[PDB]
Design a protein around this ligand. Structure first.
Ligand SMILES: *[C@H](C)[C@H]1/C(=C/c2[nH]c(/C=C3N=C(/C=C4\NC(=O)C(CC)=C4C)C(C)=C\3CCC(=O)O)c(CCC(=O)O)c2C)NC(=O)[C@@H]1C
Ligand SMILES: *[C@H](C)[C@H]1/C(=C/c2[nH]c(/C=C3N=C(/C=C4\NC(=O)C(CC)=C4C)C(C)=C\3CCC(=O)O)c(CCC(=O)O)c2C)NC(=O)[C@@H]1C
Ligand SMILES: *[C@H](C)[C@H]1/C(=C/c2[nH]c(/C=C3N=C(/C=C4\NC(=O)C(CC)=C4C)C(C)=C\3CCC(=O)O)c(CCC(=O)O)c2C)NC(=O)[C@@H]1C
Ligand SMILES: *[C@H](C)[C@H]1/C(=C/c2[nH]c(/C=C3N=C(/C=C4\NC(=O)C(CC)=C4C)C(C)=C\3CCC(=O)O)c(CCC(=O)O)c2C)NC(=O)[C@@H]1C
Ligand SMILES: *[C@H](C)[C@H]1/C(=C/c2[nH]c(/C=C3N=C(/C=C4\NC(=O)C(CC)=C4C)C(C)=C\3CCC(=O)O)c(CCC(=O)O)c2C)NC(=O)[C@@H]1C
Ligand SMILES: *[C@H](C)[C@H]1/C(=C/c2[nH]c(/C=C3N=C(/C=C4\NC(=O)C(CC)=C4C)C(C)=C\3CCC(=O)O)c(CCC(=O)O)c2C)NC(=O)[C@@H]1C
Ligand SMILES: *[C@H](C)[C@H]1/C(=C/c2[nH]c(/C=C3N=C(/C=C4\NC(=O)C(CC)=C4C)C(C)=C\3CCC(=O)O)c(CCC(=O)O)c2C)NC(=O)[C@@H]1C
Ligand SMILES: *[C@H](C)[C@H]1/C(=C/c2[nH]c(/C=C3N=C(/C=C4\NC(=O)C(CC)=C4C)C(C)=C\3CCC(=O)O)c(CCC(=O)O)c2C)NC(=O)[C@@H]1C
Ligand SMILES: *[C@H](C)[C@H]1/C(=C/c2[nH]c(/C=C3N=C(/C=C4\NC(=O)C(CC)=C4C)C(C)=C\3CCC(=O)O)c(CCC(=O)O)c2C)NC(=O)[C@@H]1C
Ligand SMILES: *[C@H](C)[C@H]1/C(=C/c2[nH]c(/C=C3N=C(/C=C4\NC(=O)C(CC)=C4C)C(C)=C\3CCC(=O)O)c(CCC(=O)O)c2C)NC(=O)[C@@H]1C
Ligand SMILES: *[C@H](C)[C@H]1/C(=C/c2[nH]c(/C=C3N=C(/C=C4\NC(=O)C(CC)=C4C)C(C)=C\3CCC(=O)O)c(CCC(=O)O)c2C)NC(=O)[C@@H]1C
Lengths: 117, 162, 172, 172, 162, 172, 162, 162, 172
């Protein structure tokens, strides 16, 4: 009984995310390069939910251009957003919130009940 | 949905603390204002229709060419839609007055406004006139704080549209 | 989130209509009570610490075993949690009371709560008990304050109850 | 990911063998059509905006309720999402068309979609309808271009169809 | 520092949005309240001293042993401190009334309260009595909303201490 | 952050004293003006879009080079930024106006703005100009409303000015 | 700036690997196409002006009311701008042909397009016509692949505008 | 799996955009090249066996001691494996030619190469010779671009091994 | 990033003009060389491992102390870094070579490198040396291939050199 390599991935539809491409902001970044990190960050950090024009956070991503803040600081600004609160936390229970924060902030899920506590 | 009351709860909740005097003060504000707000809503709700007709109409005066054949303003379907739409704007405004926050407006009207409008080639301009015309009429039926409130919300949309 | 006003709106929206005059009169009335409503909340928040403290004492006098080795409130670590939880539930209840709507309480707090407790091995029964103990103490304050203009708060008092009870039920 | 070539490889691999001469000739031929294939894609991408715009208009003329209060395309926010979705589906289809393989479409785009739609309450049937509406319009362009050397694109046209249909089916 | 006004600004600032009607309603609430608040502060500020004496005193009645030699209540330095401390609590409370938020209290008194108290072995209990005694006196000089306000803040501390 | 009230407190704190009666009377009167103060703010926010739109037009009519290739407002991308910035500054100014204190505007926005602009090669002078253009338009509204109770707003108007000017200066 | 060559470098660079055969193949593609692309650019560059006149004009035919007083199309300044703008579009297109990527277009024209247009109340529609009219003219001076290329880029904008 | 076609899709997909001219140019590159690539594969596929024999052999000449008893090259099982392995390398190479990318190589052979080799004490060196010997033979049956392609891929492995 | 084409564009843009006919002819010519250009790159990438290996051996034969205790290439950990670095520089150089522009090399790779090396106590001189050693070996391959159509690559060869040299200089 034979399986193509990457059969395990294609079942479970983890094919896209299994090995996952990293996006890095680089020095003297171009205008298109930054746009791509933003695009990525909003997809991971936010949930794969839809960010409409109104939703976007102008001030945080302006600082990301001109290197005032790093991407780690960009992520922190995104995470403390009416928008992040409105989705995620305000409707969720603390168990569902903490489990969501693991994932968006770090790809893993929570390893144990202690971590939740 | 963003109203005064929901917000203070939210803020309290974030910090993880009981509602203290700070927040109640705020709440109190919302409640005392309500009397005026509520009044305004009763007034708009009643004259709705008349406001709508007047607006739609206006738009056409402002942009005659819309009514010509092969344009968007042309043929009843479109006119019907145009009416419907403005009704909505109004409806929501009333809601917001009563809810005591922009909440209702934000979630129904504003969020996604741009893209919708882009994809169907609705010109913000039009809506705006509608609103303005309205604002002008409302500026007769109301007065004092009731009026003030009505304006605020009406404008809020103008700004969102533009 | 949601509260009394917003709720009514939403309903109205699906009908596709302006708010019914009848419906306004619910809200109009609701406003009038505000002052009462507020004081109620104020009373809880002002007494918070105590409310809990009290309820706890009574809880542990009844169910001695919780605090005995092998029980769920032992050792310190656990005890701490148990106190913390009580408080939270209270906090939310208050929130609801202000909003004039259960929602906030349901969504943040009650949703999944039972199951959590279960997975941990926390005895849901006892939790519920605590909630009631709290309820009674809390009402105590709401209903007997000092320097407040005298009048009838019953309406509010009952709504308070309900919130506590929703909690008790869903946990239990 | 996968595409026509890669796929054939993988098959060959499980047999454990070098590629059959017969099998090469599939790929050899596939190459020859490239130019046609490309133009097809180019046609979609060039007309994208419109394809959608169009389909939408028709979708909403048919299923009036979607745009009525209580429907799934109301209010604005929802409408916007629906438009975005249509675009995404299209985008993928195109991708597939270039690859010469459904896979990409199935995995990234269709995978999970039904369940999502269910959770949201979005009516899968209507979605499917939209996809078809798109299909027809799209083919329209693929099949009737200007300034391209005249010849037969049918083969490609049909494959295009299939992609659209896989979509329709899995959503539905 | 958390006051009504600062918060709404903050919230507006985070979202990146103009102050709309929502927030102003809240602000209106504060400033409306202020009249009562301000009154309360004038009352406390004036009787300060007398309140302090009374409190310190009380504490000793409540906990006689403190005044015995080898204890904390014993020897003037300590008494001086004891006075000073309560003064502070009071001072801040007034501040908070005027500022229209708990802000002043939170940042001066509350933050770090526990650890300070632990390291110097100040028993929360004491402070509490002080406050309670105060509350009781204030419950004469004031009335109606002014009173209510005074209480709120006084309590806020009780809860933080306990 | 800070505002009129908080500020006075802080001062008093370092002296170690209760608030001076004199000082209260600043705040007492400040309260009285509230209503005016509020309307002022409301006026800006209500007209925001316009204020900017207007200012921009005038800015570009004057400094035509900004919008020519090689200028700082070209191409689109840049233009967009320039508009966005204007708006922000406005937003903060309003905030200050409500607070009754410059602080919020200076700390959040002005501190370091000049240097940024410099590093980018944005001409600070032009920025400043824009800010003034805005100022005038804004005052225009603050000072000429309809359906507000007629009275004297000067006091507020001037304070508004100052805020705008702090901005202009620190940028410039 | 996004061209074929820059992209493959970027991708290679991200993974941290040398350019292998995969990428070169791609590059090769770009270079083969260039001959056609370059030809197209020579053709547009030469007829620029004439294309522009024709377009601007068209727009007015399509939207007569623009030329009426108190409108946007009215008074020379505006016409001048209108011309300028279209020139730009064209200019960039040529660039993109030569660069062998949308890059130039994206960064100059597209990014920020929406907001600019909103704030100054330029209707995308207009531009579009301009382009279409152009496309039609170009559809004479060019042929075969050169043509095809020209179209691609022209369209790319239409889609971005709409 | 990394081929030209998959990559451009991927890149397009990440940015969230349609395949525009940029990517198609690249694709075109892959397809034009294919003719040469395909030719090369037909040539290797046919001579497979002979290439394999030759290689295995070579290795032993290069490293006589392997064939001595108590070594790795010794005893048929090992020889069989040795053969098998090289076959694989070849097989994949052909695949990669046809797929028009290193992908097939990367995913089958390269990923995990080191650790496998470490744990079983396969010396990279060996493989390398095999390849080199091959390269030399291929350098007769092929010519011009077909050849060039063959090399590229063969090397790619050499570098990965080393 | 940038490269030969994009660069010329940008220049043209600031002038505000279509590309000069003269300027086109640079690019036109550049295209013609492509095939040569490509092979050059291909040669480096194909031999990468070796290029380095080689250079290293020679580097360490010359500067024995680097590999002695107290030197900068000792112990293993450091040695590893040193190898890695060499490679990187190479990688970039190649990139540049394809682009037809130094930029990529300067901006990602060379910028700040000197100072780093300094802070660590890495001897910049030696680094530079390594880079040259690499250069010569690399050219070796570029310039002496087999199965390539014979012709003149000098032009490319020199440009290659320059890249290596920019590296050497900025490090040194
Ligand atoms: C439009 C033809 C129909 C329609 C669609 C619809 N979808 C949503 C909401 C979502 N749709 C998706 C789907 C996707 N995410 C993806 O990445 C993909 C492609 C891989 C898809 C297709 C998601 C995730 C959402 C949630 C968005 C979010 O997170 O905010 C809605 C809106 C429902 C809502 O209330 O948000 C709609 C309307 N529904 C119709 O009625 C049309 C027939
Ligand atoms: C009136 C000033 C002009 C006009 C309007 C008009 N609107 C549409 C179509 C739509 N308008 C809206 C508006 C809303 N629908 C919502 O759900 C909300 C939020 C509650 C709003 C504000 C929407 C979304 C649509 C698209 C879907 C639909 O079919 O309604 C049209 C038709 C456009 C078309 O392409 O068919 C028109 C014409 N008509 C006039 O006479 C004025 C010019
Ligand atoms: C006290 C009346 C009873 C009690 C409580 C108890 N709870 C835990 C642990 C947790 N309880 C919760 C509570 C919540 N999660 C939420 O999201 C909410 C609403 C926002 C609440 C109220 C959670 C998250 C935990 C798990 C994390 C943790 O372990 O701290 C314990 C500890 C369980 C353990 O075995 O450690 C206890 C003891 N138990 C009693 O004895 C009382 C009847
Ligand atoms: C009900 C549980 C108990 C009670 C309450 C009660 N309160 C009032 C009237 C007022 N109480 C307040 C309190 C506040 N208003 C605010 O804005 C805030 C937060 C900033 C508070 C804390 C106020 C201002 C009023 C109005 C003025 C006044 O004191 O009269 C009443 C009277 C009824 C009414 O206001 O309609 C009552 C009954 N008293 C009881 O009898 C219950 C034990
Ligand atoms: C099919 C839907 C329609 C059609 C297509 C068609 N195309 C060609 C030929 C070519 N088309 C292209 C297009 C490209 N090649 C590329 O490299 C790119 C990306 C940069 C594109 C867009 C090319 C280069 C050719 C070759 C020259 C030519 O234009 O003919 C044909 C001719 C047949 C062939 O095998 O090439 C056809 C039929 N024509 C139709 O009638 C269909 C509706
Ligand atoms: C009064 C009930 C008792 C008492 C008090 C007492 N306090 C100290 C020492 C400290 N008290 C405080 C408290 C504060 N300092 C602050 O900055 C604030 C916030 C504005 C408070 C509330 C602090 C910090 C100290 C530590 C040292 C200091 O004096 O600043 C003492 C001295 C105890 C010691 O040995 O350090 C005492 C005794 N005095 C009495 O008699 C009562 C029992
Ligand atoms: C418009 C009147 C003038 C102008 C503006 C301009 N600014 C930038 C770039 C930036 N502006 C800022 C500033 C802010 N962002 C913030 O978060 C805040 C509040 C703290 C401000 C005020 C920043 C962060 C940037 C850099 C990154 C970005 O683009 O967001 C530009 C663009 C410059 C560029 O190189 O892209 C411009 C055009 N310049 C003019 O021409 C006008 C006179
Ligand atoms: C000043 C810039 C111009 C002006 C203002 C003005 N306003 C009033 C009085 C009021 N304005 C308000 C407005 C609000 N109060 C709130 O709570 C809110 C937010 C929800 C607003 C926006 C109110 C309620 C009053 C009180 C009385 C009233 O019905 O307006 C005055 C009169 C003086 C006063 O302080 O009462 C004035 C002068 N009108 C002008 O003449 C200036 C050009
Ligand atoms: C022509 C179709 C119509 C027209 C045009 C018109 N445009 C403007 C103003 C601007 N147009 C642009 C466009 C660009 N500037 C850029 O930097 C780029 C990208 C490089 C583009 C595409 C811009 C940015 C402006 C604003 C700046 C400026 O106006 O100088 C106007 C002026 C409108 C106004 O000032 O409010 C006009 C009128 N007018 C016509 O005749 C047609 C209807
Ligand atoms: C030939 C040059 C030498 C030789 C080789 C040899 N190999 C093994 C065992 C393995 N070789 C590989 C290599 C691969 N297997 C794969 O799946 C792939 C990817 C497609 C490769 C490249 C593997 C994985 C093994 C280990 C698993 C296995 O049992 O085969 C051996 C046996 C090693 C042992 O210790 O048993 C040998 C000897 N034999 C010779 O004569 C040359 C010296
Ligand atoms: C230069 C350092 C050496 C040299 C180069 C040289 N190459 C050619 C011609 C070609 N080389 C290639 C190479 C490629 N084209 C591709 O698409 C790819 C990537 C997949 C490669 C690797 C090709 C296709 C050609 C054209 C056809 C051919 O048979 O070569 C030449 C000939 C001149 C020309 O530009 O056509 C030359 C001179 N020759 C040397 O002697 C130098 C040492």
């Amino acid at each position: 009984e034979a399986t193509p390599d990457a059969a395990a991935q294609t079942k479970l539809g983890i094919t896209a995310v299994a090995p996952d491409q990293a996006v890095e902001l680089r020095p003297n970044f171009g205008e298109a390069e930054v746009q791509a990190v933003i695009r990525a960050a909003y997809k991971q950090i936010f949930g794969n939910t839809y960010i409409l024009e109104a939703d976007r956070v102008v001030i945080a991503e302006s600082l990301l251009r001109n290197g005032s803040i790093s991407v780690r600081e960009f992520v922190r600004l995104l995470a403390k957003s009416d928008l992040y609160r409105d989705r995620f936390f305000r409707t969720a229970s603390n168990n569902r919130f903490i489990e969501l924060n693991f994932k968006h902030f770090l790809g893993r899920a929570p390893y144990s009940q202690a971590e939740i506590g | 949905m963003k109203t005064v009351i929901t917000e203070v709860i939210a803020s309290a909740d974030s910090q993880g603390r009981f509602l203290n005097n700070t927040e109640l003060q705020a709440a109190n504000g919302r409640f005392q204002r309500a009397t005026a707000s509520m009044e305004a809503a009763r007034a708009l709700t009643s004259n709705a229709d008349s406001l709508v007709k007047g607006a739609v109409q206006e738009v056409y005066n402002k942009f005659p060419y819309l009514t010509q054949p092969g344009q968007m303003g042309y043929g009843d379907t479109n006119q019907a839609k145009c009416a419907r739409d403005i009704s909505h704007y109004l409806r929501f405004i009333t809601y917001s007055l009563v809810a005591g926050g922009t909440g209702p407006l934000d979630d129904y009207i504003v969020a996604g406004l741009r893209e919708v409008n882009r994809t169907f080639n609705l010109s913000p301009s039009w809506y705006i006139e509608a609103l303005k015309h309205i604002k002008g009429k409302v500026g007769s039926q109301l007065s004092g704080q009731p009026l003030t409130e009505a304006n605020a919300y009406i404008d809020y949309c103008i700004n969102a549209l533009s | 989130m949601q509260d009394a006003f917003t709720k009514a709106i939403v309903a109205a929206d699906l009908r596709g209509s302006f708010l019914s005059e009848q419906e306004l009169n619910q809200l109009t009335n609701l406003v009038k009570e505000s002052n009462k409503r507020l004081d109620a909340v104020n009373a809880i928040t002002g007494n918070a610490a105590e409310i809990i403290s009290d309820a706890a004492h009574k809880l542990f006098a009844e169910q001695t075993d919780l605090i005995r080795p092998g029980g769920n409130a032992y050792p310190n670590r656990r005890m701490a949690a148990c106190l913390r939880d009580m408080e939270i539930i209270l906090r939310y209840v208050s929130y609801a009371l202000l909003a004039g709507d259960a929602s906030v309480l349901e969504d943040r707090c009650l949703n999944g709560l039972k199951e959590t407790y279960v997975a941990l091995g926390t005895p849901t029964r006892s939790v519920a008990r605590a909630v009631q103990l709290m309820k009674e103490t809390a009402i105590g304050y709401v209903n007997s304050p000092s320097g407040v203009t005298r009048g009838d708060c019953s309406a509010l008092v009952n709504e308070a109850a309900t919130y506590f009870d929703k909690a008790a039920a869903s946990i239990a």
